[PDB]
Ligand binder design. Structure first.
Ligand SMILES: CCCCCCCC/C=C\CCCCCCCC(=O)OC[C@H](COP(=O)(O)OCC[N+](C)(C)C)OC(=O)CCCCCCC/C=C\CCCCCCCC
Ligand SMILES: CCCCCCCC/C=C\CCCCCCCC(=O)OC[C@H](COP(=O)(O)OCC[N+](C)(C)C)OC(=O)CCCCCCC/C=C\CCCCCCCC
Ligand SMILES: CCCCCCCC/C=C\CCCCCCCC(=O)OC[C@H](COP(=O)(O)OCC[N+](C)(C)C)OC(=O)CCCCCCC/C=C\CCCCCCCC
Ligand SMILES: CCCCCCCC/C=C\CCCCCCCC(=O)OC[C@H](COP(=O)(O)OCC[N+](C)(C)C)OC(=O)CCCCCCC/C=C\CCCCCCCC
Ligand SMILES: CCCCCCCC/C=C\CCCCCCCC(=O)OC[C@H](COP(=O)(O)OCC[N+](C)(C)C)OC(=O)CCCCCCC/C=C\CCCCCCCC
Ligand SMILES: CCCCCCCCCCCCCCCCCC(=O)OC[C@H](COP(=O)(O)OC[C@H](N)C(=O)O)OC(=O)CCCCCCCCCCCCCCCCC
Ligand SMILES: CCCCCCCCCCCCCCCCCCOC[C@@H](O)COP(=O)(O)OCC[N+](C)(C)C
Ligand SMILES: CCCCCCCCCCCCCCCCCCOC[C@@H](O)COP(=O)(O)OCC[N+](C)(C)C
Ligand SMILES: CCCCCCCCCCCCCCCCCCOC[C@@H](O)COP(=O)(O)OCC[N+](C)(C)C
Ligand SMILES: CCCCCCCCCCCCCCCCCCOC[C@@H](O)COP(=O)(O)OCC[N+](C)(C)C
Ligand SMILES: CCCCCCCCCCCCCCCCCCOC[C@@H](O)COP(=O)(O)OCC[N+](C)(C)C
Ligand SMILES: CCCCCCCCCCCCCCCCCCOC[C@@H](O)COP(=O)(O)OCC[N+](C)(C)C
Ligand SMILES: CCCCCCCCCCCCCCCCCCOC[C@@H](O)COP(=O)(O)OCC[N+](C)(C)C
Ligand SMILES: *[C@@H]1O[C@H](CO)[C@@H](O[C@@H]2O[C@H](CO)[C@@H](O)[C@H](O)[C@H]2NC(C)=O)[C@H](O)[C@H]1NC(C)=O
Ligand SMILES: CC(C)CCC[C@@H](C)[C@H]1CC[C@H]2[C@@H]3CC=C4C[C@@H](O)CC[C@]4(C)[C@H]3CC[C@]12C
Ligand SMILES: *[C@@H]1O[C@H](CO)[C@@H](O)[C@H](O)[C@H]1NC(C)=O
Lengths: 173, 1145
């Protein structure tokens, strides 16, 4: 089912990058009609400006030149009950670095009851020149190799120590 | 003179025949719920016959009018009371006629006397009931303790509901709760799941159920199930604990309690289900079984042109009796069976014609051979062979069926062809031995079946008279349509069906309806009497009968070096630690692994680490042991296969060949790595060795039961093939009126004109012999059986809409299948496996096959611990005050008073309630404080007088520890409830009061013996639980890998699914008792739309589609329930039977 996964925080210049915004329902069997709002403040600027709105099944984009012709939608398709509100940027540039906000406006339908919900997700990405491997990935490989060599050393030491002792014991009898 | 001839008539044999004839017709006449007016005449005739009996016995046994020998016989008291009651009805009317009529069913009890075999079985019933006295007391004690625990932990949880959280006309929860009357009103303010009669439960914890957005979760309103499912009071908690003990619809209790309290409260259930159900049910079984053996052993000891066709006769004789013809005839039987098992619903006409010609060929062969074997033998001698007359009867049935003018209705004849299959028993070695096992004591089985039928008849009539009118006068409180439900007691057949279902172990839903419609007291008394008499006693006597019926030299130096290294204890400890780490790494891979990126990478590399380590271990074992020694060993073969699978997967990943069809399925085999724990822990090794030595006999019994189940499955295919299609309204899942859409064509016309209409079939149906086997498994395990039975009794024809109870009398098919298949087969499996266990114990030389060596030593110490001799008295101190207190406390009256004080404290704990006033809380608090003072004073008094020899008694140590725990728990609970804020921790701490109750077993001789049996049984149960945990782990990983991303339909929901480790183990523990396996199987069985969607996005991951593999699902669930049966049920029973014999010795 739906699993809330956080976006990545590192886009590589010239390439493409997908920004994740997933907002589950508390109960999956419920009915809802969700639309979406994204706002973005560039680093070194203090204002969240609106960039795009996706409702029904149409995507509306503003006139900001930082995103024209290079943003497409990557959420739930043909559902009207979104639960996944992601964004794709083709041809990432240096201007796509700052703080993102994925506003979620949900309307649940109940027996004789209608609820307006709101959830705001905060995403902060920075564009770079060359992707650098995660510190966990760097550390884990080194630890794997050192563990392999340590186990091999321990095994060989035990083999040598046991061989000398048993070879000494042969001459006794 | 007249009295003498009266005696002479009384002793006449005609008396019994006429009287018993009357009672039989009367019993027939008691089954009419709306008798006509002419029935009153024959009713008066019955009263006249019975008073005639009474008068003749009076004259005969009234040598003097004092009537001395008439009242001797208790049955004569029964006759007198029925006569005086009947004439009370005749002379006067008081207004209790239905109750007045209720008593004359006891005239069915005369049937015991006239058949001599019944008195033996009723003697067994009485002696079995007599010896259940200790076990019923122990059951009341244990259920009371567990009911106090459940009342403490879940006192008000089941009243939790989802409240609207936003009210409009300036209201409050109280103002609403005063106004609401009906479910339609409740649904406005509370969250109700679609099609449910109860509001959805939620909890305040983070691991409990979640009330949705816009709803806030509050304790208000009634409990579920009309209000009878609760822990609000000791009586309702006791009902819930009895329901848990009998495992009757206990999975509902499981799921509501977990959804309201929390998923971490499943420890209660585990402890309760494992220790309370099993021990006490198998204790009841053990007591009944040993009572019957001892009684049976006592009984055994106490009792001890013409000559032309004569020449044709000779010729045909020496031509027809060669060994060839019989083997060919059995081959004909097998071929006929294989042909007749190839029937299925969408059968092309060609294939139908094929079976038609095959049927003609086979029936011709059998009838012809019957003629040729008739001609050569004298008919009076030809009928001597018991098998041969059976063959002729089969031939006559097959000829009348074939050559009668074709009729559509008579498919019973069609189903009758199956009976040829039993002729295989003429040559089958094991089946003949089995029928011999019955034939030694078949009188006992017949009399037991007769007693069971009489009991079910009597209870059916009593239920129909007592509760019959209620079900139709207050018909609505139990059905929203104001029409009668599926199970009721308005007719004789349906009352009989309810009593049969209670005998099958399902008594609480029909009981909820009963109490709702006709009062709690009567319904409770009726159902409890029925359950006790049938299920606990008679159905256990059956299993008791079945159980009794079964009774360069440098290379060599290198090799030695590797040998030493591998045999070293540190090496084994390191390897076991690696195995456990590898299994935990498997457990970490949920559907949430995307969020845990770091842990994902760490396990990605740890997998390579473990593969390296285990390849190194394999190589060292190769160098040390050798190839012959290594590959001659099964455990090493298992390890070798797992390492090869892991290496193949790693190489495929390294070479870039990953993301390949077949290879992706080699990653599901990663769930098999836990299997290396089997070779390292001795407990599961001994338990597996116990299970392996019994497979040879399980195979033969399985073969016999497969033949029987195949006959039943082909009968079901004949009766029900393609008739379970129904044309439903998918919005609410309701079958159409069957007068709007009579058949399939109009249903498709509806789908063409309107949407949300579907011509839907059942997922587990009787469409072919393969699916018939699954349906029989559900019917035999009583899980999902009602869904099949409802569509079976509703079937009309193939392309016709079902009608409500059109084929009502198809219930008899399932009654017969249950009786033979379920009961006989499962009991036969149990006895065969237990007898094989006993054979193993004998071969080993009287050694417990469920214990390791150290467990054996500790178990011998435990045995020594419970057969001790009197110890030396504590010497009297001479301080002249210590001496007086020594008298005072050594006196028996002291311990008796302490026991009555403990009983009073138990009663004080029992009166707690949900919603009790603050004054009540204070009063009970202070009574408990005074009790604590009394017990602390008793401890202090024993310490002064007995000095330091107090700690030389095992029970005194327990009492002293309980005193400490009670004082500490009281003070700590006060501190938590005053200063800290933790109601859950406050409840868990206040659970310490229970320790005062457990002190009551000190002065109970029977409870002590049975608990000592459990204490000595504990090690083997620990071994079995260890192996069961390993199996549960493996199946949890495999279901996590396969059955996540499934539609969540019947038994799969937001909390009980296969998405994480905890959820999977919760589901698997539920299914260990075989409870609800149909509901979890059903969402997996659907594979193609509109049942599922193979292109579902599942946000947060890249898995696509939500519907499982029927093959994998069926294999999964069937194998798991079979393994759980074999492991827990049979071995728990065996350990209980051995240790009960040891303990009562
Ligand atoms: C609801 C749950 C209720 C649980 C009740 C737990 C009660 C706990 C009691 C603590 C026991 C402390 C015992 C100290 C002395 C133990 C001892 O000395 O043994 C006393 C009895 C057996 O001795 P006996 O007098 O029956 O001798 C006759 C033996 N005969 C006749 C069978 C051959 O054993 C016993 O009750 C020990 C009973 C141990 C039960 C373990 C249950 C684990 C779960
Ligand atoms: C063998 C021979 C027969 C043995 C069994 C005999 C057992 C019971 C006999 C009848 C005893 C109960 C009589 C009840 C009369 C009564 O009216 O009782 C009132 C109490 C409380 O009534 P209430 O209005 O709060 O409940 C209302 C629930 N609502 C909200 C729907 C209204 O009802 C209750 O507690 C009843 C709770 C259940 C009583 C214990 C059940 C024990 C079950 C199995 C024991 C087997 C050993
Ligand atoms: C004492 C007894 C205690 C335990 C009782 C047994 C427990 C339950 C055992 C089996 C039940 C599950 C078996 C269900 C399998 C069939 C399900 C099914 O969907 O049936 C249909 C499929 C055929 O496929 P289709 O309809 O697509 O045809 C293709 C369509 N066209 C022809 C147009 C291309 O059936 C096939 O695969 C044909 C082969 C069916 C697979 C195995 C059948 C054997 C059945 C029973 C013997 C197993 C006993 C041993 C287990 C105890 C240990
Ligand atoms: C919180 C939940 C749990 C709370 C309680 C946990 C521990 C409770 C009890 C455990 C200790 C008592 C049970 C074991 C007793 C072992 C024993 O045998 O008892 C040792 C001494 C009395 O032995 P003795 O040297 O006088 O015997 C001399 C014999 N002769 C002279 C004939 C050779 O017990 C003593 O000192 C007194 C022991 C005092 C124990 C702590 C009291 C705290 C207040
Ligand atoms: C929710 C409920 C929360 C409250 C629970 C509170 C109670 C929990 C734990 C308290 C356990 C205290 C165990 C007391 C027995 C200790 C003992 O000393 O054990 C002796 C008995 C045999 O005693 P004896 O008569 O030969 O005297 C000889 C005594 N000595 C050894 C000094 C020579 O050994 C045995 O079976 C020991 C059998 C132990 C069975 C424990 C069952 C716990 C349940
Ligand atoms: C209230 C406190 C506990 C009740 C009083 C206990 C008490 O008065 O002494 C009782 C025992 C001390 O016995 P002893 O000296 O080892 O040997 C027997 C003695 N010498 C005799 O004449 O035979 O006392 C003991 O055995 C020592 C431990 C007593 C209990 C400690 C925890 C109390 C809570
Ligand atoms: C013998 C059987 C032993 C069974 C032991 C296992 C059962 C152990 C039962 O405990 C499972 C719960 O703690 C699960 O808690 P949650 O609902 O928070 O699950 C986490 C979901 N999120 C937070 C990731 C979304
Ligand atoms: C015990 C020894 C005998 C049985 C051996 C079985 C194989 C060894 C199994 O033992 C370890 C498992 O209990 C691991 O379960 P975990 O609780 O670590 O996994 C949960 C992790 N999440 C899902 C909560 C994040
Ligand atoms: C990779 C290399 C694998 C080499 C495998 C050699 C296969 C060697 C196959 O030979 C099998 C037997 O000769 C081994 O003899 P035993 O196991 O009875 O004697 C063993 C004595 N110690 C050494 C155990 C004390
Ligand atoms: C496979 O290769 C095995 C050889 O290295 C040694 O043969 P073994 O000694 O393991 O097997 C022969 C044992 N017999 C022939 C004496 C039974
Ligand atoms: C996944 C699809 C199914 C794949 C197979 C899964 C089950 C694999 C087998 C597991 C269940 C079988 O595992 C134990 C077997 O290897 C038998 O072991 P033994 O007891 O015969 O070993 C003999 C050694 N002593 C102790 C007798 C001397
Ligand atoms: C007594 C000893 C008991 C030992 C228990 C051993 C149980 C072994 C596990 C049985 C597990 C029960 O079957 C689960 C299936 O996943 C196994 O079938 P496969 O291995 O073919 O899985 C392939 C699924 N794919 C390929 C479609 C994805
Ligand atoms: C331990 C003993 C375990 C015995 C388990 C016996 C179970 C046998 C299961 C065979 C289970 C074989 O079932 C195959 C059919 O269910 C396939 O269903 P479909 O025709 O819908 O195919 C769709 C794709 N699948
Ligand atoms: C299938 O059932 C649904 C309801 O279970 C039917 O829809 C109802 O139609 C009536 C028509 O008068 C309306 O008054 C109800 O409000 C409808 N209910 C719902 C929930 O929409 C539907 O008509 C049924 N379909 C068929 C073919 O009978
Ligand atoms: C769409 C239709 C044609 C699918 C049905 C396919 C038929 C031919 C299949 C489905 C299940 C099969 C049966 C499954 C199990 C058994 C039991 C075995 O002991 C004898 C054969 C028998 C009875 C099989 C014969 C053929 C069978 C009936
Ligand atoms: C609440 O729902 C209305 C429509 O019903 C919508 O106009 C409004 O935007 C929602 N609330 C918020 C905060 O967006």
């Amino acid at each position: 089912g739906c699993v809330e996964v956080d976006s990545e925080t590192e886009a590589v210049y010239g390439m493409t990058f997908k920004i994740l915004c997933i907002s589950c329902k508390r109960r999956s069997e419920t009915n809802a009609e969700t639309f979406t709002e994204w706002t973005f403040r560039q680093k070194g600027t203090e204002e969240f400006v609106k960039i795009l709105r996706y409702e029904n099944e149409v995507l509306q984009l503003e006139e900001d030149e930082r995103f024209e012709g290079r943003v497409v939608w990557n959420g739930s398709r043909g559902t009207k009950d979104l639960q996944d509100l992601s964004i794709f940027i083709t041809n990432v540039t240096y201007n796509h670095s700052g703080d993102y906000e994925c506003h979620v406006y949900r309307l649940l339908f109940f027996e004789n009851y209608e609820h307006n919900t709101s959830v705001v997700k905060k995403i902060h990405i920075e564009v770079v020149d060359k992707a650098n491997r995660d510190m966990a990935s760097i550390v884990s490989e080194i630890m794997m190799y050192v563990l392999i060599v340590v186990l091999t050393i321990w095994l060989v030491a035990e083999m040598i120590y046991c061989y000398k002792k048993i070879a000494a014991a042969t001459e006794t009898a | 003179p007249l009295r003498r001839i009266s005696i002479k008539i009384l002793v006449h044999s005609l008396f019994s025949m006429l009287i018993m004839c009357t009672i039989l017709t009367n019993c027939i006449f008691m089954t009419m719920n709306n008798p006509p007016d002419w029935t009153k005449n024959v009713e008066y005739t019955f009263t006249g016959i019975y008073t005639f009996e009474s008068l003749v016995k009076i004259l005969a046994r009234g040598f003097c009018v004092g009537e001395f020998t008439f009242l001797r016989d208790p049955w004569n008291w029964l006759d007198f009371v029925v006569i005086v009651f009947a004439y009370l009805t005749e002379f006067v009317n008081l207004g209790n006629v239905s109750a007045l009529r209720t008593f004359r069913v006891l005239r069915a009890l005369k049937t015991i006397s006239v058949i001599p075999g019944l008195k033996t079985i009723v003697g067994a019933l009485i002696q079995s009931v007599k010896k259940l006295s200790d076990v019923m007391i122990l059951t009341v004690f244990c259920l009371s303790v567990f009911a106090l625990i459940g009342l403490q932990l879940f006192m008000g949880n089941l009243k939790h509901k989802c409240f609207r959280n936003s009210l409009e006309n300036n209201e409050t929860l109280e103002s609403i709760m005063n106004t609401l009357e009906s479910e339609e009103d409740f649904r406005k303010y509370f969250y109700y799941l679609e099609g449910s009669k109860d509001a959805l439960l939620c909890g305040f914890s983070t691991d409990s159920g979640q009330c949705p957005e816009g709803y806030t979760c509050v304790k208000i309103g009634r409990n579920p199930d009309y209000g009878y499912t609760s822990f609000d009071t000791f009586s309702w908690a006791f009902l819930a604990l009895f329901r848990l003990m009998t495992q009757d619809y206990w999975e509902n209790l499981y799921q509501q309690t977990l959804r309201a309290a929390g998923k971490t409260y499943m420890i209660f259930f585990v402890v309760v289900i494992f220790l309370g159900s099993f021990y006490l049910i198998n204790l009841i079984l053990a007591v009944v079984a040993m009572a019957y053996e001892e009684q049976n052993q006592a009984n055994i000891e106490e009792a001890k042109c013409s000559p032309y066709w004569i020449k044709f006769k000779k010729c045909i004789y020496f031509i027809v009796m060669d060994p060839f013809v019989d083997l060919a005839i059995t081959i004909c039987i097998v071929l006929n069976t294989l042909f007749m098992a190839m029937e299925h619903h969408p059968m092309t006409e060609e294939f139908k014609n094929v079976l038609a010609i095959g049927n003609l060929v086979f029936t011709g062969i059998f009838a012809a051979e019957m003629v040729l074997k008739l001609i050569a033998m004298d008919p009076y001698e030809y009928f001597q062979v018991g098998w041969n007359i059976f063959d002729s009867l089969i031939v006559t049935l097959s000829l009348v069926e074939l050559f009668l003018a074709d009729v559509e209705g008579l498919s019973v004849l069609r189903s009758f062809r199956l009976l040829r299959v039993f002729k295989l028993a003429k040559s089958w070695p094991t089946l003949n031995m089995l029928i011999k096992i019955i034939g030694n004591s078949v009188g006992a089985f017949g009399n037991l079946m007769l007693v069971l039928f009489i009991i079910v008849f009597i209870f059916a009539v009593v239920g129909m008279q007592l509760f019959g009118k209620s079900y139709k006068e207050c018909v609505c409180k139990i059905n929203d349509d104001c029409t009668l439900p599926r199970w009721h007691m308005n007719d004789f057949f349906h009352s009989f069906l309810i009593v049969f279902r209670v005998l099958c172990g399902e008594w609480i839903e029909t009981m909820w309806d009963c109490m709702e419609v006709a009062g709690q007291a009567m319904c409770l008394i009726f159902y409890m009497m029925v359950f006790f008499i049938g299920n606990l006693v008679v159905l256990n006597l059956f299993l008791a009968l079945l159980l009794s019926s079964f009774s360069g030299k440098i290379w060599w130096n290198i090799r030695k070096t590797c040998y030493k290294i591998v045999e070293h204890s540190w090496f084994e400890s390191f390897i076991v630690l690696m195995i456990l780490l590898s299994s935990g790494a498997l457990a970490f891979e949920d559907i949430y692994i995307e969020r845990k990126k770091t842990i994902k990478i760490i396990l990605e590399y740890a997998d390579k680490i473990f593969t390296y380590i285990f390849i190194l271990e394999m190589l060292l074992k190769w160098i040390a042991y050798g190839y012959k020694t290594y590959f001659t060993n099964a455990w090493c073969w298992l390890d070798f296969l797992i390492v090869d699978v892991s290496l193949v997967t790693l190489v495929a990943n390294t070479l870039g060949y990953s993301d390949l069809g077949p290879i992706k399925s080699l990653r599901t085999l990663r769930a098999l790595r836990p299997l290396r724990a089997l070779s390292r822990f001795e407990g599961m090794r001994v338990v597996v060795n116990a299970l392996i030595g019994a497979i040879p006999s399980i195979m033969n019994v399985l073969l016999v039961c497969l033949i029987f189940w195949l006959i039943f499955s082909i009968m079901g295919v004949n009766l029900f093939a393609g008739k379970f299609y129904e044309c439903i309204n998918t919005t609410d899942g309701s079958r159409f009126p069957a007068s709007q859409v009579p058949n399939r064509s109009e249903c498709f016309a509806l789908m063409n004109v309107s949407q949300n209409v579907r011509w839907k079939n059942l997922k587990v149906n009787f469409d072919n012999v393969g699916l018939g086997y699954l349906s029989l498994l559900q019917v035999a395990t009583f899980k999902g059986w009602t869904i099949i039975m409802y569509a079976a009794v509703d079937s009309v024809n193939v392309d016709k809409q079902p009608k409500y109870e059109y084929s009502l009398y198809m219930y008899i098919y399932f009654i017969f299948f249950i009786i033979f298949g379920s009961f006989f087969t499962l009991n036969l499996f149990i006895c065969v496996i237990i007898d094989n266990f006993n054979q193993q114990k004998k071969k080993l030389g009287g050694q417990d096959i469920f214990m390791t060596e150290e467990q054996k030593k500790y178990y011998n110490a435990m045995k020594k611990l419970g057969s001790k001799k009197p110890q030396k008295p504590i010497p009297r101190p001479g301080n002249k005050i210590q001496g007086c207190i020594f008298d005072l406390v050594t006196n028996q009256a002291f311990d008796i008073s302490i026991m009555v004080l403990i009983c009073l404290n138990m009663v004080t704990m029992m009166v707690e309630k949900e919603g009790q006033s603050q004054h009540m809380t204070e009063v009970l608090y202070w009574i408990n404080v005074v009790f604590i003072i009394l017990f602390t004073g008793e401890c202090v008094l024993k310490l002064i007088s007995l000095r330091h020899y107090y700690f030389t008694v095992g029970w005194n140590i327990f009492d002293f520890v309980v005193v400490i725990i009670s004082i500490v728990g009281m003070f700590l609970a006060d501190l938590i409830e005053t200063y800290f804020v933790s109601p859950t921790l406050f409840r868990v701490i206040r659970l310490a009061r229970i320790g005062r109750i457990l002190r009551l077993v000190k002065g109970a001789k029977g409870i002590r013996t049975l608990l000592f049996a459990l204490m000595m049984s504990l090690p083997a149960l620990f071994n079995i639980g260890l192996l069961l945990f390993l199996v549960m782990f493996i199946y949890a990983i495999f279901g996590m890998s396969n059955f996540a991303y499934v539609k969540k339909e019947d038994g799969i929901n937001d909390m009980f699914n296969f998405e994480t480790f905890g959820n999977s183990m919760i589901c698997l523990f539920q299914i260990t008792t075989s409870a609800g396996w149909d509901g979890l199987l059903a969402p997996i069985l659907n594979s193609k739309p509109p049942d599922c969607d193979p292109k579902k996005v599942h946000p947060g991951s890249s898995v696509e589609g939500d519907c499982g593999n029927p093959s994998v699902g069926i294999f999964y669930f069937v194998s798991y329930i079979i393994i759980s049966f074999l492991v827990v049920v049979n071995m728990y029973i065996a350990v209980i039977l051995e240790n009960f014999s040891v303990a009562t010795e």
